Amino acid sequence: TTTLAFRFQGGIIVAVDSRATAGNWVASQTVKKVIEINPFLLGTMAGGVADCQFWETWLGSQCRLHELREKERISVAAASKILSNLVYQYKGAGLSMGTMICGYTRKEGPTIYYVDSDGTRLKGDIFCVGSGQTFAYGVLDSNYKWDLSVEDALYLGKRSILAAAHRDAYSGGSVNLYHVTEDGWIYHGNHDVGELFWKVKEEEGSFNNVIG
């Protein structure tokens, strides 16, 4: 798995791979690793697939109940903390979760929270989680600026997953892109890594090591 999310001028970019494995066996190449908690919040999936799915859908229900009771959009801080407090109750039981709770509200602006099954809850500008996180970090760190355009930021996130998909054996399949704005997230398509690799190699001149 490779999931990333980073804050920038135009909001948040979320990018994830699509592969799911059971040992060496590639169980699925079409896994949806971005949960649409609601039309304004996104969650990423790493570690336990079920654990992430179940509890981030549940999170959506809690967020919905909040705004029904409070007549106001839930904050990213509050939404993330509902999830982190929940998994902390299950600490030790064997839940496996690494997720970014991504959102854009009025009072906070664009906000990302790394939430962990050990109970870790961190706010930050750039996060990368999964077996291929290190590869994605390399591309992100050397190319990140706050004043990226929505177009360039989307590409950077896509390229960073591609980097990981290539090298990390347990990452691949396809790249899902999202762009989070204050008026809600915007899906930017499913991109097959097989086709994306050859496209990027030619246009960018990168991956000179690989023969195409």
Partner: protein
């Protein structure tokens, strides 16, 4: 030890190797050179279990230096790397194996080509444009995949290497106390004293 990198450019091989030596809870040294010159145009960096690393490197060094004198001739990097691989492949089924990973950077004076070989403690050899051992590759290969070109100059290779070291210094938990960089080209081996 920890991080050893290698990159083969147009006309040279560049090897970057960490300076830290840690034993337990203390960094005993911050200027350790994890490399041995096997021959005038062949350099070997190394990382693995304490003691075994230097013992193996110097043992290889001695054997190549012995060959050099006997034949009055420098072995090709390919030949040296094959000799090294066999020693490690012999080692892995021994009573106590050498726990040593190496990079062999050499300039073949016959073909006029730089050559980088990555060999692990099992005796797994691969010729590469750029290589690493341990966790180093996890951070650096994404950058190298992106930026690397086969026609890069030595100066460009160093700039790309700086970007790799910067990433490592940002995301690695261990303080490896910077790297000693060495260039292997047609004129031999030299050290970049400012990095």
């Amino acid at each position: 030890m920890d991080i050893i990198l290698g990159i083969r450019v147009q006309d040279s091989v560049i090897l970057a190797s960490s300076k830290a030596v840690t034993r337990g809870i203390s960094v005993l040294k911050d200027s350790d050179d994890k490399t041995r010159q096997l021959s005038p145009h062949t350099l070997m960096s190394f990382a693995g279990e304490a003691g075994d690393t230097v013992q193996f490197a110097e043992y290889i060094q001695a054997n190549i230096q012995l060959y050099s004198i006997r034949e009055d001739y420098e072995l090709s990097p390919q030949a040296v790397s094959s000799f090294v691989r066999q020693e490690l492949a012999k080692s892995i089924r021994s009573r106590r194996p050498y726990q040593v990973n190496v990079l062999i950077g050499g300039y073949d004076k016959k073909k006029n080509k730089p050559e980088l070989y990555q060999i692990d403690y099992l005796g797994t050899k691969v010729e590469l444009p750029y290589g690493a051992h341990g966790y180093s590759g996890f951070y650096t290969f994404s950058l190298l995949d992106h930026h690397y070109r086969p026609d890069m100059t030595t100066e460009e290779g160093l700039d790309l290497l700086k970007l790799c070291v910067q990433e490592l210094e940002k995301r690695m938990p261990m303080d490896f106390k910077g790297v000693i960089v060495k260039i292997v080209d047609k004129d031999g081996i030299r050290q970049v004293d400012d990095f």
